[PDB]
Amino acid sequence: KIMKSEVLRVTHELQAMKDKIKENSEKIKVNKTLPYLVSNVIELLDVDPQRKGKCAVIKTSTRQTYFLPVIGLVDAEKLKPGDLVGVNKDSYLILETLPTEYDSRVKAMEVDERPTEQYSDIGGLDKQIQELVEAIVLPMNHKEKFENLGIQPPKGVLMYGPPGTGKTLLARACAAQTKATFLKLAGPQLVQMFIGDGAKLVRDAFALAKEKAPSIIFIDELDAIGTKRFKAGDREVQRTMLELLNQLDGFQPNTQVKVIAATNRVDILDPALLRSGRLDRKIEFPMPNEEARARIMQIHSRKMNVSPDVNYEELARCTDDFNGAQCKAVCVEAGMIALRRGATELTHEDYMEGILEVQ
Amino acid sequence: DYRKKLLEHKEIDGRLKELREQLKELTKQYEKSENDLKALQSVGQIVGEVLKQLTEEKFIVKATNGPRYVVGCRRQLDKSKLKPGTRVALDMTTLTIMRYLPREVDPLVYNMSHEDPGNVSYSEIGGLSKGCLLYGPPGTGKTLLARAVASQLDCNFLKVVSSSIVDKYIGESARLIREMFNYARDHQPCIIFMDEIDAIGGRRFSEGTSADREIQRTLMELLNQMDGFDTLHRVKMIMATNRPDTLDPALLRPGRLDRKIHIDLPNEQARLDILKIHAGPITKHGEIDYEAIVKLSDGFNGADLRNVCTEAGMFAIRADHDFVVQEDFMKAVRKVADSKKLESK
Amino acid sequence: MADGGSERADGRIVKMEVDYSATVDQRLPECAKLAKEGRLQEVIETLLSLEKQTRTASDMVSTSRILVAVVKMCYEAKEWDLLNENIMLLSKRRSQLKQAVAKMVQQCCTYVEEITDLPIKLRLIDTLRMVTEGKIYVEIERARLTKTLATIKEQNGDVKEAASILQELQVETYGSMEKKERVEFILEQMRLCLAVKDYIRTQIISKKINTKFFQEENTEKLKLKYYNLMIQLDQHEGSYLSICKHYRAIYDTPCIQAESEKWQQALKSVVLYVILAPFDNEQSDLVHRISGDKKLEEIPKYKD
DSSP, X not given: OOGGGGHHXXXXXXXXXHHHHHHXXXXXHHHSSOOOSOEEEEEOOOOOOOOOOOOEEEEXXXXXXXXXXXXXXXXXSOSSSOOOBOOOSSSOOOOOBOOOOOOHHHHTSOOBSOOSOOGGGOXXXXXXXXXXXXXXXXHHHOTTHHHHHTOOOOSEEEEEOOTTSOTXXXXXXXXXXXXXXXXXXXXXXXXXXXXXXXXXXXXXXHHHHHHSSSEEEEEEOOTTTOOOOOOOHHHHHHHHHHHHXXXXXXXXXXXXXXXXXXXXXXXXXXXXXXXXXXXXXXOOOOOOOHHHHHHHHHHHTSSXXXXXXXXXXXXXXXXXXXXXXXXXXXXXXXXXXXXHTSOSSBOSHHHHHHHHHHO | OHHHHHHHHHHHHHHHHSSSHHHHTHHHHHHHHHHHHHHTTOOOEEEEEEOOOOSSSSEEEEOTTSOEEEEOOOSSSOSSTTSTTSOEEEESSTTOOXXXXXXXXXXXXXXXXXXXXXXXXXXXXXXXXXXXXEEOSSOOOHHHXXXXXXXXXOSSOOEEETTSOOOSSSSOTHHHHHHHHXXXXXXXXXXXXXXXXXXXXXXXXXXXXHHHHHHHHHHHHHHHHHTTSOOOSSOEEEEEOSOTTSSOTTTTOTTTEEEEEEOSOOSHHHHHHHHHHHTSSOOOOSOOOOHHHHHHOOSOOHHHHHHHHHHHHHHHHTTTOSSOOSHHHHHHHHHHHHHHHHTOO | OTHHHHHHHHHHHHHOSSOOTHHHHHHHHHHHHHHHSOOOTTTTHHHHTTHHHHHHHHHHHHTTSOXXXXXXXXXXXXXXXXXXXXXXXXXXOOSXXXXXXXXXXXXXXXTSSSSOHHHHHHHHHHHHHHHHHHOOSOSSHHHHHHHHHHHHHHHHTOOTTXXXXXXXXXXXXXXXXXXXXXXXXXXXXXXXXXHHOOHHHHHHOOTTTSSSOSSSSOOOSOHHHHHHTTSSHHHHHSSSGGGTTTTTSGGGHHHHSOXXXXXXXXXXXXXXXXXXXOTTTHHHHHHHHHTTOHHHHTSGGGOO
């Protein structure tokens, strides 16, 4: 062991390095304390002919352009044309880069932490919603098993069906089970007055989904803008829409946060929406029958003082060709006039009274 | 007694030599921290532009902010890059010149930055042994092939999206056909991809409106630059689409689309090969039988065959079993594939 | 759908055993409309991979025992695109055409050794005009027929076809990507050049020879032998400079083959290119590429 006796000197040199890094690593707090302003960064690779070529183009908020190479600490998500970077008074070096927003009108579209309703609020849809509950639970907790089996969850699920069925409050009810950040987005929001806004909205959606923590982005009314016209505004929505499909087709690292979509009608079906990353999960959600409407209306009305003498035959007969949110409006209306009816207990005539009231 | 002390001392020496790797690896990063701290000391540089040069040693610079200045020549650099018309950089002190600043553009960063890695994808396309037509029979994977060679070399990443010929304003897209195809004629190597051409492939059977007439006019520029007065012997275009019925029979002339590659799974060896490359990282019971999966599958989609096989892995993971028997493969590829036949209209 | 022509195919091969060529003339209207119909792209491929074997099988039966070959060469020589003139929608197939021409050159390959000297000159003079009339091919069979005819012209004593083979070779080498076949067929450039000895033709063709090729994607087992066979007529036409850039690249020849015979040729010519090297610049640096080799001092000419 005489040859291994020199390792002690090496360990003393290494622990001496750990003893001497406290000062030069301690000045990181006083030099990198606070970037006083915000400056935009534009990446531009240079060539010096080590003597290697590496540079970047800087633009300050006060419209002043300077010169500086690519510097700082170990960069992994950096080197992109972003904003909100670290900068000193006049040295103009890059110390702390963090991606920034602005145009808060799109950043704060729907800031929801978690909803209140859960999946146990409906009745008679487990045979078709269980695939989605699995498709949101197993890709969140069973990421370890995805390497033994080599499974990548799909990113596009088509939640299509007739309107009024509750395709938004139910997907939100499953978003309560996702436990991730919920972020809504409307179809018509892409149609703006200025040019090129849809690119900023799409790259913003993948900017918060790509940059932020694992979240949930549910969109709706996609059919209202998914028109395949052959000037035209829906062809501009083909520029933005086909741009989004290009970001769901040309991006293999799209294994991150999913993009859930829902269409209120499948009349104008875009044929280019078929792909593993695109809307491949096509589970048909038809109009609930009087039995299913009595189930979702019973579980949605399990909180009000409902009379126990309900055979569901009269309401089952009156509810003809109705939807889920329509019976939800009947439940809410019953909870509205049942107050002014004097009797604190919900009666049986209030069902048809609400059906003929709002419809 | 003596023979055991050599092995025991070899074990003490082993656990003594197995602790250096936990420090000597991160000490390189710790020293790299101070290397960067010594690399961030070059600060205070500004930019400028050169318009007119009077003296060979000292010339006039034009700053971005608007005020103009005059600078000298540094003893290190030479008069090669000092010629006018090249954007350079300056310093706040003495207005010296460290190096120049090569110009660029905004979309040029997008056209010169996207790169897709992966060299095995060229050999993962399955048993598949001036323009190419990739049409849309019941079989997919054209994006995996075009992006497989494109991910292999492609010599560039000149991707042409079918949504880039929108031209919201007056339909003068000829500046973009001649601009981009003029870039293809300028750069000696060039490969062009045209994915989802069915949207811009209107058959103009009836009287088209102003929105259709401009797209068909861009198709007239395509005619005038494919079989007009301009050859395309060196450049190559890849027309990908979805339905082989509305593919502009005027453009279906064999002068442009020489061969036809039907993206399908006809051969048993191609379906078995793609099934094996998609069945790489999957684990399953020792009982293997792929001839039933390949035999029962008739005219299906490749990437959707991956989605059906992984869908059978989800059907098998519903019962949270680590091992996966091939019964759920035959019955889940069977039933789910029959659902794809139902949704194959 | 090819299901209609498949029964006519597998039934036609059974019914067509002893019948003369008149029944083929009765088959001409049966196959004309059969080729006109079938707009399907991938379905009729079997019909075109069966009917052509029925008509060429009947050609085999007709050419089996007795053959005049006049009406045979007149049928195809006069009927090429008769079915392709009524169809306005060209299906741009080019899938059975390679099997068509390859099967025709295969049957002509089985009939090309010794059958009858009369029809071979008209058949070959017909197919070399079909080379010009084609204008679209993989450039394999078009070179095959003219080089297998040129080999006969080598012993025939008629070297007038050199302008034909070497004029058509330029067309048969541009427009496609050929790695192996281009080197195997490029020897015809300097094959008949010993009989032609045209200096301007040599100036056109090492120029067209060394366009883009250094080492890779071309394996022959004798590559160096064809190198010596290609930079020897340029030494015959040139005087000294032709070998200065050639003998500097034959240093890998002893590494590929046995070094026993390299002393007489490689280590003999290792000094001639540097003796004939220009006195301005190449003599100064080219003397260091051979210095240091242990086999150099063993030569008695090392003192020279």
